[PDB]
């Protein structure tokens, strides 16, 4: 799903994803990191 992170590097959607739903996967757009299942 999509967060209002924005982004520089993956590594950031990547804790944000996991924190705040059950995930852990992730990888950003150039409009904001966004997260995977």
Known sequence: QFT??????????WSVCQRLHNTSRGKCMNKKC????
């Open 4 to 13: 209002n992170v924005s982004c520089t590097t993956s590594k950031e959607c």
């Open 34 to 37: 966004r997260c995977y299942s």
